Design a protein around this nucleic acid. Structure first.
Lengths: 15, 427
DNA sequence: AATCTTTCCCACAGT
DNA sequence: TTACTGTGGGAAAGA
């Protein structure tokens, strides 16, 4: 059980 | 005489990023073999990154000694699979100096070895050899597994790296690799990301807890770019067959394996999947078949495979050398014994030669060559390793301990950073 | 036996 | 438009 830090990139919605 | 001096070692260790040359070889951990006349190409393509401002310095020396002794300072590389019946193939060509990839490598069934590695040999266009550098080992497989045993090659452990690719209707030309570029995910036909795949622990966050263990279908997973540390949102990995996501209460029994096709669903909406549209990564909504199955398209289907990395670092500290930089020594571990003036260290690793000397920081130390996997030396006294010149570099300011990096130095002045630090708080 | 792996086969959908 | 070929599914053969 480790902690990770990583900013998230959100995939753009389709239309 | 080209022997490393302490002043030069100190300048190097304080300024590694403008001197040190890095060669990083990336590749999958398994390759499917080819029968008969066919060629089943290694995917993702083994590739080599030459990293560091040191490469430009090296070109500069080769340029400035071209006129003592124009495009004969251009890089030439070849790669093969260590087989005497296998063709060597020519490689293509921020701190990234240069990049090449091998897109048409394969291994035939006539080659009976269970494991192999790749040897990339680098030259300057004038014929001058830089050297040969090996990948990690690669396991030969006949086909992807359909089990419902060695896990180290076939399963996917949380914390390890994977490449993900998209291919349409069995067409080599269509292959695109998940890759981050410009702080965003995209799909590339030339470059591929190695992503750390983690079992999420438990609406989302920049900081998250992770679990050890094998990744199963139906597992919630965090994919993290190994180069930029950027992540995708939480995704549940799903098995796919033929533009359908199989959601059955039974595939969760199955561990994800090499070269399996899968899909990634968003945790918020069970009908939304990670999907590729013209090299753009998108959220695409599936159409429900029933409770056990969803309708998607070949754009939401990814092949997954485990990847590895072989990295080498060198600097020609005393000027350009006459001989190849390789074999590059690799240090796997330090084994220390005794306390005081009794204290010694055995270096464990690979590719040692008797022409190497260990340096504790900027302090050279008498070195016993035992074999190509064993060097032996005495630990020099703190007082001679940290002095009024080096105190700033070798002193932990929190704990006060003396910490020095271990280098291997060749008698013509090539310094090989080991990656390892000796701490006097050992002992 | 039953299931999995290895090897052989061949069509599809491209260049 | 026609010749040729990585690739993936499936059959066959082996473990």
């Amino acid at each position: 059980r480790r902690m990770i830090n990583a900013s998230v990139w959100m995939p753009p919605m389709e239309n | 005489v080209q022997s490393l001096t302490s002043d030069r070692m100190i300048d190097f260790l304080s300024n590694k990023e403008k001197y040190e040359c890095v060669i990083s070889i990336f590749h999958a951990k398994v390759a499917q073999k080819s029968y008969g006349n066919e060629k089943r190409f290694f995917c993702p393509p083994p590739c080599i990154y030459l990293i560091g401002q040191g490469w430009k310095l090296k070109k500069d020396r080769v340029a400035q000694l071209y006129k003592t002794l124009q495009q004969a300072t251009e890089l030439v590389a070849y790669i093969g699979i260590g087989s005497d019946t296998s063709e060597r193939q020519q490689l293509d060509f921020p701190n990234i100096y240069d990049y090449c990839a091998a897109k048409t490598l394969y291994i035939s069934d006539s080659d009976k070895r269970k494991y192999f590695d790749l040897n990339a040999q680098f030259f300057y266009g004038c014929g001058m050899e830089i050297g040969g550098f090996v990948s990690q080992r690669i396991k030969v497989i006949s086909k992807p597994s359909k089990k419902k045993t060695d896990c180290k090659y076939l399963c996917i452990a949380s914390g390890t790296k994977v490449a993900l690719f998209n291919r349409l209707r069995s067409q080599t030309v269509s292959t695109r690799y998940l890759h981050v570029e410009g702080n965003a995910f995209h799909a590339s036909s030339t470059k591929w990301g190695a992503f750390t795949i983690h079992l999420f622990d438990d609406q989302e966050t920049d900081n998250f807890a992770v679990r050890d263990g094998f990744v199963y279908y139906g597992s919630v997973v965090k994919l993290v770019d190994s180069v930029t540390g950027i992540a995708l949102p939480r995704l549940r990995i799903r098995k796919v067959d033929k533009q359908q996501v199989i959601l059955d209460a039974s595939c969760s029994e199955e561990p994800v394996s090499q070269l399996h096709k899968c899909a990634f669903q968003m945790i918020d909406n069970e009908l939304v999947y990670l999907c590729l549209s013209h090299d753009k990564i998108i959220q695409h909504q599936a159409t429900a078949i029933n409770e056990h199955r969803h309708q998607i398209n070949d754009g939401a289907a990814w092949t997954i495979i485990s990847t590895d990395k072989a990295e080498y670092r060198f600097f020609e500290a005393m000027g350009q050398v006459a001989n190849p930089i390789s074999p590059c020594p690799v240090v796997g571990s330090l084994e220390v014994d005794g306390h005081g003036e009794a204290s010694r260290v055995e270096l464990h690793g690979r590719d040692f030669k008797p022409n190497l000397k260990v340096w504790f920081g900027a302090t050279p130390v008498e070195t016993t060559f035992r074999s190509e996997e064993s060097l032996h030396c005495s630990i020099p006294p703190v007082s001679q390793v940290r002095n009024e010149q080096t105190h700033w570099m070798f002193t932990n300011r929190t704990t006060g301990d003396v910490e020095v990096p271990i280098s291997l130095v060749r008698d013509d002045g090539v310094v090989y950073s080991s990656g390892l630090t000796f701490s006097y708080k050992s002992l």
